[PDB]
Design a protein around this nucleic acid. Structure first.
Ligand code: NA
Ligand code: NA
Length: 326
DNA sequence: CCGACGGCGCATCAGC
DNA sequence: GCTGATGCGA
DNA sequence: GTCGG
């Protein structure tokens, strides 16, 4: 909160770059800047002070000086009042509506949730669902609800086939007090990188979850990845729980733990391990870990049967997810 | 100066 | 109808 | 917008 005004500012500039100007790299540049500054244990007094932080350049430094001297940014103030831009930016909060769709909608007069509600025929399946649960999707999930959600998922998966292995990752696995959604990694001994991928291993799990009315909607669904909506059962006379976003990924047995490691995060922790992995002759990614030859040629992936194995390779002591903040 | 900046599954579109 | 490109979310 | 080869 030391520089909340500054980080809020950069984050707002960030969204407009992505959603309105469609300049994704500028979006990430602003986010990077907002992040480094968010971790700075001091109240910034000038643009030059912040410029020393990695990610803050001349332009953001110039903007910080303006904000400190006036308490605002003229360019930001302007875009905020712009009917077209503020509307485009806003519409992207609807899942399924990206920068392009937001732009086309505003071009034809569709600027608010109400406008969207009156134009269902112009919305695809995903977008209709994003609109339907607009409010719910923006709410966070208390860990206690995640536990109840995990209980259902683990139970139903085992019910389908006790040989399935399912792991709820994300900040939740690291012990987060709340979550934005639920990410489930699924695998089965019968499915490996070079074997049959039976088009129903994932389907049977999604089907069972719908049968017990846990999964309520489907955004997308293929043979390896499902993205949908779910909701805990409500108690009599009890305010119903909000709908939640849940993804379920089927990964080959041999790439499962590389998957759990990666989707467990955090993002910052992954980069460090990737760096360390490199400075050890190994290359780690979402799927595997491979040795790097002398001339930089990657060798075939190394056998992995646990998160620990990955650590063993890069000479690192296994770390509990609760400590993988970075 | 000027290219990199993350990458892939799925839904849907463009081009044939 | 088929194939590759694009939008989207993660 | 920022970095760096
Ligand atoms: Na800097
Ligand atoms: Na969106």
């Amino acid at each position: 909160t030391l520089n909340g005004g500054i980080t809020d500012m950069l984050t707002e500039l960030a969204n407009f770059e992505k959603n309105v100007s469609q300049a994704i790299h500028k979006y990430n540049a602003y986010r990077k800047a907002a992040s480094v500054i968010a971790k700075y244990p001091h109240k910034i007094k000038s643009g030059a002070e912040a410029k020393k932080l990695p990610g803050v350049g001349t332009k953001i430094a110039e903007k910080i000086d303006e904000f400190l001297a006036t308490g605002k940014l003229r360019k930001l103030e302007k875009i905020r009042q712009d009917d077209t831009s503020s509307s485009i930016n806003f519409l992207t909060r609807v899942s399924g509506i990206g920068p392009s769709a937001a732009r086309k909608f505003v071009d034809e007069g569709i600027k608010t949730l109400e406008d969207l509600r009156k134009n269902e025929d112009k919305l695809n399946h995903h977008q209709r669902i994003g609109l339907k649960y607009f409010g719910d999707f923006e709410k966070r999930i208390p860990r206690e609800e995640m536990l109840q959600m995990q209980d259902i998922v683990l139970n139903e998966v085992k019910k389908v086939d006790s040989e399935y292995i399912a792991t709820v990752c994300g900040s939740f696995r690291r012990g987060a007090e709340s979550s934005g959604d639920m990410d489930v990694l699924l695998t089965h001994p019968s499915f490996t990188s070079e074997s049959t991928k039976q088009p129903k291993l994932l389907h049977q799990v999604v089907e069972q979850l719908q049968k017990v009315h846990f999964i309520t909607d489907t955004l997308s669904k293929g043979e390896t990845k499902f993205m949908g909506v779910c909701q805990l059962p409500s108690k009599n006379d009890e305010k119903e729980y909000p709908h939640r976003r849940i993804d379920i990924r089927l990964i080959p047995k041999d790439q499962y733990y590389c998957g759990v490691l990666y989707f467990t995060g955090s993002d910052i922790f992954n980069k460090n391990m990737r760096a360390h992995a490199l400075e050890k002759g190994f290359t780690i990614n979402e799927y595997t870990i491979r040795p790097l030859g002398v001339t930089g040629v990657a060798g075939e992936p190394l056998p992995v049967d646990s998160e620990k194995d990955i650590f063993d390779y890069i000479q690192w002591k296994y770390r509990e997810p609760k400590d993988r903040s970075e």
